[PDB]
Design a protein around this ligand. Sequence first.
Ligand SMILES: *[C@@H]1O[C@H](CO[C@@H]2O[C@@H](C)[C@@H](O)[C@@H](O)[C@@H]2O)[C@@H](O[C@@H]2O[C@H](CO)[C@@H](O[C@@H]3O[C@H](CO[C@H]4O[C@H](CO)[C@@H](O)[C@H](O)[C@@H]4O)[C@@H](O)[C@H](O[C@H]4O[C@H](CO)[C@@H](O)[C@H](O)[C@@H]4O)[C@@H]3O)[C@H](O)[C@H]2NC(C)=O)[C@H](O)[C@H]1NC(C)=O
Ligand SMILES: *[C@@H]1O[C@H](CO[C@@H]2O[C@@H](C)[C@@H](O)[C@@H](O)[C@@H]2O)[C@@H](O[C@@H]2O[C@H](CO)[C@@H](O[C@@H]3O[C@H](CO)[C@@H](O)[C@H](O)[C@@H]3O)[C@H](O)[C@H]2NC(C)=O)[C@H](O)[C@H]1NC(C)=O
Ligand SMILES: *[C@@H]1O[C@H](CO[C@@H]2O[C@@H](C)[C@@H](O)[C@@H](O)[C@@H]2O)[C@@H](O[C@@H]2O[C@H](CO)[C@@H](O)[C@H](O)[C@H]2NC(C)=O)[C@H](O)[C@H]1NC(C)=O
Ligand SMILES: *[C@@H]1O[C@H](CO[C@@H]2O[C@@H](C)[C@@H](O)[C@@H](O)[C@@H]2O)[C@@H](O[C@@H]2O[C@H](CO)[C@@H](O)[C@H](O)[C@H]2NC(C)=O)[C@H](O)[C@H]1NC(C)=O
Ligand SMILES: *[C@@H]1O[C@H](CO)[C@@H](O[C@@H]2O[C@H](CO)[C@@H](O)[C@H](O)[C@H]2NC(C)=O)[C@H](O)[C@H]1NC(C)=O
Ligand SMILES: [Zn+2]
Ligand SMILES: [Zn+2]
Ligand SMILES: [Zn+2]
Length: 534
Amino acid sequence: HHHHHHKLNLTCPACKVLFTALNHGLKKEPNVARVGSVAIKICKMLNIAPLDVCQSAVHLFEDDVVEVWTRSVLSPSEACGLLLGSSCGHWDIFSTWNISLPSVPKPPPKPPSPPAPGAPVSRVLFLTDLHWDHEYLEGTDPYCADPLCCRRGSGWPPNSQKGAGFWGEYSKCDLPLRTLESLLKGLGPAGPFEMVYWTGDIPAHDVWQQSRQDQLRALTTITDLVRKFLGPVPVYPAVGNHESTPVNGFPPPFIKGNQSSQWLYEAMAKAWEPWLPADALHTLRIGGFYALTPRPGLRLISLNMNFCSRENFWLLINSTDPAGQLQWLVEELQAAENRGDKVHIIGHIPPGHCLKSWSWNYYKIIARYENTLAGQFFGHTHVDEFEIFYDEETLSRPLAVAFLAPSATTFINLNPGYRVYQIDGNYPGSSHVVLDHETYILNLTQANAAGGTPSWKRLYRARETYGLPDAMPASWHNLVYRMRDDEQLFQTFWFLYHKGHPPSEPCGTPCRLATLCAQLSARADSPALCRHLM
Ligand SMILES: *[C@@H]1O[C@H](CO[C@@H]2O[C@@H](C)[C@@H](O)[C@@H](O)[C@@H]2O)[C@@H](O[C@@H]2O[C@H](CO)[C@@H](O[C@@H]3O[C@H](CO[C@H]4O[C@H](CO)[C@@H](O)[C@H](O)[C@@H]4O)[C@@H](O)[C@H](O[C@H]4O[C@H](CO)[C@@H](O)[C@H](O)[C@@H]4O)[C@@H]3O)[C@H](O)[C@H]2NC(C)=O)[C@H](O)[C@H]1NC(C)=O
Ligand SMILES: *[C@@H]1O[C@H](CO[C@@H]2O[C@@H](C)[C@@H](O)[C@@H](O)[C@@H]2O)[C@@H](O[C@@H]2O[C@H](CO)[C@@H](O[C@@H]3O[C@H](CO)[C@@H](O)[C@H](O)[C@@H]3O)[C@H](O)[C@H]2NC(C)=O)[C@H](O)[C@H]1NC(C)=O
Ligand SMILES: *[C@@H]1O[C@H](CO[C@@H]2O[C@@H](C)[C@@H](O)[C@@H](O)[C@@H]2O)[C@@H](O[C@@H]2O[C@H](CO)[C@@H](O)[C@H](O)[C@H]2NC(C)=O)[C@H](O)[C@H]1NC(C)=O
Ligand SMILES: *[C@@H]1O[C@H](CO[C@@H]2O[C@@H](C)[C@@H](O)[C@@H](O)[C@@H]2O)[C@@H](O[C@@H]2O[C@H](CO)[C@@H](O)[C@H](O)[C@H]2NC(C)=O)[C@H](O)[C@H]1NC(C)=O
Ligand SMILES: *[C@@H]1O[C@H](CO)[C@@H](O[C@@H]2O[C@H](CO)[C@@H](O)[C@H](O)[C@H]2NC(C)=O)[C@H](O)[C@H]1NC(C)=O
Ligand SMILES: [Zn+2]
Ligand SMILES: [Zn+2]
Ligand SMILES: [Zn+2]
């Protein structure tokens, strides 16, 4: 219904035909091998790390990345839409998207009330980033050329240098199974616990040679070891980013067949059946997230933060609220608000590391349900730190805080560690909020020492060391700016940051202001949050 006397519509289908031809030529197996076998020769041409890795890294990524480009950019409706305009398609890739909040008016912000005298306190264990390395070996080179050392294939160290420790090593290494058994055995004094939050990243960083059997092997092995030492204590876990292979590869639910992540989510639903109820397992299989009620007046929500990860290449195809998760979260929160319940959110990748649009909608959801939210717990960063949320309009009022627990693994150059949270206990009228938290470590210098002992000691208690009236958002907000001025205090945070094993290089003024900026930045791509630091 368009009027012309010079236009040739020969260019619109010529585009569609031509890209449609590419895809058919890329799927051909004899062509895929051509794109792999050349890659080995290219890693020498681009001055890349050991080529032996390249012969493996590019192999696993190829089939999945290609499919994503054919389904995203080289999709006829997508590419031709970029060149010729709305006439021959639409360019949807990484388009901005929003979420709709319910029509329910937002209640006035009510600060939680301090716990009454004689109010019980519950202890919550927090395991994150275990990263079991089946191929960990003692005495092997910790400074190999591969991305991951201390394992079979990294060879032995030269000049009679000191090999890898028996319990781990300060380097780009992961943990042997024994060191995780030691962690779970020494939970006597740190307990008792009412429940455990377990935010994934079970398999090691040997991403280049991870079959699906090795990923399910790590799943059931550790899930069996954890259930063994926690007994009747329920463990509520979340999906990490090393759980699938290839790493970070989590195709949303709309993708079907062998290439979907059904192989993973359905194996989880079997390993985690003793912990999760029926309705929770349903959504677990589909998209790897779920919600449940661990105790009266509290709602637990486990998000699959892979559907926000830059590293998840499958999100090109459609990066709008993958799996409908944010829409589902809003429904869960809003329902809780009506019930008068509070909510705990657990995930792997902190919201500050997500895609800009995803993170901005999460940030606005938190603010809307500030009164309903009682805790946010995440991991991934392998480090002890936090992220403060502010009001969407002015970015001046702290209204929620997310705790990024440090990792059980040594990757990279850290002490093993775990984290126990003290929360307002199980009783009607409880705020369910975090009251304080404790961090335990395994000083490797001691354990690996001759005749050493594997003793898990408490590194510190949160309020005690930082002198905090409470674990509310306003107290961490104050702490950050306190460290902006007090150098000794920051060096304490810096020391605990790395679980008590700081780097050799001192952290100067530009390194400090950057690290504090991270604590205020729960919204990705938002420099205004650090206007007061620099
Ligand atoms: C890219 O993905 C976007 C994300 O949506 C997901 O992506 C696709 C691939 C599917 O996997 C889909 O299941 C995912 O949710 C996508 O934008 C989103 O599109 C969906 C629909 O495709 C919108 O979801 C909701 O649709 C329902 C329809 O009724 C449901 O009920 C029936 C009967 O029980 C069931 O059989 C189904 O579950 C049906 O889905 C709407 O009812 C719902 O309304 C919401 O909003 C109103 C506001 O008036 C609220 O009051 C309600 O409580 C609901 O919360 C949704 O419309 C979804 O809204 C939409 N996203 C946004 C942000 O709007 C996009 O289309 C994809 N793009 C491309 C090019 O493929
Ligand atoms: C320029 O040409 C393209 C290509 O379409 C084809 O090319 C012409 C030379 C003629 O031979 C056409 O008969 C022929 O379709 C046009 O794109 C095409 O648009 C139509 C509708 O806009 C698409 O058809 C739809 O198909 C669905 C599913 O069957 C139906 O439900 C719809 O009712 C509708 O029929 C067609 O798929 C699409 N072609 C491709 C390859 O995607 C384009 O519209 C044309 N330019 C103008 C200005 O008309
Ligand atoms: C996504 O949201 C942005 C901004 O948030 C919305 O708009 C604010 C102005 C305010 O009304 C908030 O409560 C909303 O949640 C949208 O910004 C719109 O931008 C258009 C043009 O881009 C502009 O003309 C309007 O001022 C804004 N609002 C409306 C209703 O159009 C943005 O359009 C939304 N969509 C996307 C894809 O980003
Ligand atoms: C389902 O897929 C797996 C994986 O193989 C394919 O190629 C991988 C490199 C991956 O990137 C995806 O493109 C594909 O799914 C198949 O298992 C592989 O093949 C055998 C299994 O017996 C084994 O030697 C390989 O190591 C497996 N690879 C991995 C990464 O686990 C499996 O056979 C496929 N299922 C069906 C029915 O074909
Ligand atoms: C971890 O253990 C090592 C070894 O026992 C401790 O290192 C000692 O620390 C102080 C100096 O800071 C002195 O006792 C010695 O000079 C250090 N010895 C060595 C070999 O480094 C270390 O302090 C412990 N750290 C923690 C957090 O437990
Ligand atoms: Zn005319
Ligand atoms: Zn990790
Ligand atoms: Zn991670």
